[PDB]
């Protein structure tokens, strides 16, 4: 669910730290 999906995106996108 987006609600939780979006939150996860923030966390996930957090790791992606290195956009390299």
From Swiss-Prot:
List membrane-spanning regions.
Answer: none
Chain intervals for the UniProt region annotation (NsP1 membrane-binding): 1-20
Post-translationally, this protein is described as follows, namely: Palmitoylated by host palmitoyltransferases ZDHHC2 and ZDHHC19.
Q: Where is the signal peptide?
A: none
Subcellular location field: Host cytoplasmic vesicle membrane; Host cell membrane; Host cell projection, Host filopodium
Tell me how this protein sits in the membrane: Lipid-anchor
**Biological function:** Cytoplasmic capping enzyme that catalyzes two virus-specific reactions: methyltransferase and nsP1 guanylyltransferase. mRNA-capping is necessary since all viral RNAs are synthesized in the cytoplasm, and host capping enzymes are restricted to the nucleus. The enzymatic reaction involves a covalent link between 7-methyl-GMP and nsP1, whereas eukaryotic capping enzymes form a covalent complex only with GMP.
Q: How is the quaternary structure described?
A: Interacts with non-structural protein 3. Interacts with RNA-directed RNA polymerase nsP4. Interacts with protease nsP2. interacts with itself.
UniProt-recorded name of the protein:
mRNA-capping enzyme nsP1
Annotated source species: Semliki forest virus (SFV)
């Amino acid at each position: 669910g987006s609600t939780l999906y979006t939150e996860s995106r923030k966390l996930l996108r957090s790791w992606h730290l290195p956009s390299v």
